[PDB]
Design a protein around this ligand. Sequence first.
Ligand code: AGS
Ligand code: AGS
Ligand code: MG
Ligand code: MG
Lengths: 646, 318
Amino acid sequence: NITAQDVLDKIPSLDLSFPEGKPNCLLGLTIVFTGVLPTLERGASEALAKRYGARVTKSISSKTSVVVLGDEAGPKKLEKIKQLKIKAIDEEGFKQLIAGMPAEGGDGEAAEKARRKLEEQHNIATKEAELLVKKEEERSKKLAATRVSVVREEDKLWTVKYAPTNLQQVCGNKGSVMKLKNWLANWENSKKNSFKHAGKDGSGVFRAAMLYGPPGIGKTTAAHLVAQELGYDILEQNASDVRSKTLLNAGVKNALDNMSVVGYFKHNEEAQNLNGKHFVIIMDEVDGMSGGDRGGVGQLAQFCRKTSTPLILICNERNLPKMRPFDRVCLDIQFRRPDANSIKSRLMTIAIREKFKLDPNVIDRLIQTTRGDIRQVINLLSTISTTTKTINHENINEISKAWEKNIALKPFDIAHKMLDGQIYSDIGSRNFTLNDKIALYFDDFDFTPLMIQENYLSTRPSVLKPGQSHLEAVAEAANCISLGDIVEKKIRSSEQLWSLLPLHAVLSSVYPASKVAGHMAGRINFTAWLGQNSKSAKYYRLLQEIHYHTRLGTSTDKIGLRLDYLPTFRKRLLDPFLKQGADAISSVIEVMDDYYLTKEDWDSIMEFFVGPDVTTAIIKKIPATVKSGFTRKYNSMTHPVAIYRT
Amino acid sequence: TLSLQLPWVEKYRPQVLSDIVGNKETIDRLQQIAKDGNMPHMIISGMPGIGKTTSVHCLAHELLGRSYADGVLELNASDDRGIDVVRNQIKHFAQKKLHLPPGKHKIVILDEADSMTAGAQQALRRTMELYSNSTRFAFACNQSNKIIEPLQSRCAILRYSKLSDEDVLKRLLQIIKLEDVKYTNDGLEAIIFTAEGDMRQAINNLQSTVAGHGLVNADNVFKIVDSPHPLIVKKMLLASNLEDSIQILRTDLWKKGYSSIDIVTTSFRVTKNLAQVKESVRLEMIKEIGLTHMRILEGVGTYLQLASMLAKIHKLNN
DNA sequence: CCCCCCCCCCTTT
DNA sequence: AGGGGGGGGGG
DNA sequence: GGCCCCCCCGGC
DNA sequence: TTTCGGGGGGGCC
Ligand SMILES: Nc1ncnc2c1ncn2[C@@H]1O[C@H](COP(=O)(O)OP(=O)(O)OP(O)(O)=S)[C@@H](O)[C@H]1O
Ligand SMILES: Nc1ncnc2c1ncn2[C@@H]1O[C@H](COP(=O)(O)OP(=O)(O)OP(O)(O)=S)[C@@H](O)[C@H]1O
Ligand SMILES: [Mg+2]
Ligand SMILES: [Mg+2]
């Protein structure tokens, strides 16, 4: 009847309140939103697009159908649009488009394929609901039969009622679950080979597993289901148990190489169920091991390499320093946030069983509200369905705003957000306020100033005042950074003036960024001050050692020793080896004896010079025989000691 | 003379969910949950004097009836709530066996859960899951960010809003009707104005009036009550001329007994949230206020320093 | 087997 | 921001 | 039961 | 990283 391309052709094409349409009128058309729309905000425009089933893509691609363009569009957007020759429209164009598809279909293969996918999802949801009701019916029949000769199904949390029963019912992370199943299904072969026959997947060398991912993605569920499907008997320890070295070495340790009495007394009548007699250890919430569990992490790491039964560790965040001991002793399995297309049918099934209407078009939004948390979205559905019987586009905004998950940002994310020119503009400052910026700083107040100081010279600004240059803004930012450093020194003092922390937030992070806010010109780099400070401390300790090894013969301080004495000591200690060969040894030794210097002190002194006097290459170029003879001569004599019992 | 009267804040603390004003949607959800049952794990967040503890207590009471004394375990900041407590007492309570009506469960109330340490919150994780068929958890906090993400994932979020003037007026009028307190419209308006959405403060000021002077009018309220000094600081920092700002600072703050540190902190906070001034101007003002705050902290806290701060602020805002 | 979107996740003591 | 990785679509 | 020690925050 | 002071949680005894 009506093809989408014809309607698009009718609409005007740009060159380089709204009317109500019909259900799924934009279905099958991919729309990318760029720039600022005078009428609708980015969130409002995205909601209006998703109302009609349109798929919103964050990036422009050859498959894109239309791209609404307004004002303030980035150069990359225009470059991609021109390269891929993608049509663009205006606010009036979008208004006409949303009402120019009365047939909500009858278009190219894209719309038909989208409708087929929607029908397949509906059919899958219906089949799941049918199977669930059949299971309920058989359970009721068994209960009646038992009662003829305990927990009500309507009294359970929805997260327990609809918990996955098999590994095919788990949504998302299919690859990770498959990898875990393969690893646990070939554990016997690896054990028979002593965990040395590394397979193609590489999981044959690891006798332990480390599952990590964000909350509410199906990690504990996946581990338990994998253990159960293979017949293993599950032994579990959670954060509610004191997992310290003292009790860990007296508890679960014995089970690492012992059979299960439960398995033997429960699978005595079964056949081929070898795993029933074995153990599978599951350590849940390893990251939750606080001071109450002393030395537990090290003991778990030791067990990982000396365990005779499969061992699976579960944690939320794997990149903490505290989790370093598990660096290369377990097979790491990452569980990423499931996409909104993985749990869709599950949400239809829950809606059908619970007798409330959940429009599919608003499902995606909910996933962003909880940041891909299945437990949280199920809880949200259960709570909202209590009084609201319809979850549609007329109320999704309120629910999403009232259930937003506030996850503290990390150093890199904080730096990226705070060095963005949008938030510092009038409109951006109106939306993202100064209080929000101070809170973003407080999210990590120990690393935000360092990241800002590290990444405030590698951006192209977009907030430059009229007549100002990039260098002047950089200088102003540096001045405020110095002032913030002074304030920090005052905070960490003998007076503990922590009440000045908010002021520091404005002086160290917010103000300089506002002065150089723009677009990052390169990769965000981690602060380099910590490694440099550690190196400086090490070199200062070495300098102090040299100074107190030579104090008796020298008249100076450590600074004077470094700035003035050391070059002459180089001329007296390193130059001779380069001129007279091995014959220098004696002379050099004498000089060292004249100042109570050792070989370690020799290397430390040689490691101080910088610039044109770097001795690393020269020292490497010294003949090996000369150094060997020097060492032999040094170790073949008796030398004095400047300080006894250092 | 040695016998005390129960304050109105405790004498009229709502005992049924129908008497809690404000947050109509959440209260309706709680009422329907009580009518049906199957209470989930929940976290109630908000600001002081809004009815979070009242809501949780009313829900638990109406849910558990006569079994309140056996199915409710209440712990607050005045009780030890360390890792050992979570791992022993709460675990034993969750594992306890108790007979309750069909759709009722034991309730573990953790008031002011924000103060709880990370270890205890982590330990609660699997306990809330293994025994969810018999026990449910209700956290009440002021700052939701203090509760770890795994715990938030397991519960239902209930963020409370500040009571509007209409709801505060309704509850205040009910209290006046019950106590037969003579009042005037301006007095109630002043009480609401000082309340700032805090029902506890509103009731306390209403009792102080009547207890102090009798008939509730703006005159008596302002005689016993002081207009919030943040508004005075805002007026001082928004004056068109330096003379007016100095006059406000002297007459309304310095001569009233407010300390310099309080004044400078309030000025910082007010300048942070002045949406009618540009961000750059606010940042410069904050820099000046921080300089003055550091000077005051060093020990030099004088009227001259605050006057200099105002002069510099007016220099910037020109 | 090979390639192309679409997004996520990690840099980090 | 830049680079690596996982999964659906085309091929 | 009591010292003694180590680790971790600190604004609103 | 980091200059006191307070709190928790574990280890000797
Ligand atoms: N992939 C999933 N598919 C279906 N339901 C899920 C999924 N993930 C989580 N859920 C639901 O949320 C509940 C809890 O899932 P969990 O396995 O505990 O997630 P988790 O990642 O282990 O949570 P943490 O790490 O302890 S915060 C499940 O019983 C399910 O009801
Ligand atoms: N919605 C309300 N309706 C009627 N009275 C209220 C209401 N909210 C608070 N009050 C009154 O103020 C008193 C204290 O209320 P609370 O429930 O203790 O406030 P709260 O939010 O729990 O305090 P925080 O957050 O721990 S500082 C109640 O006894 C009531 O008398
Ligand atoms: Mg888990
Ligand atoms: Mg309270």
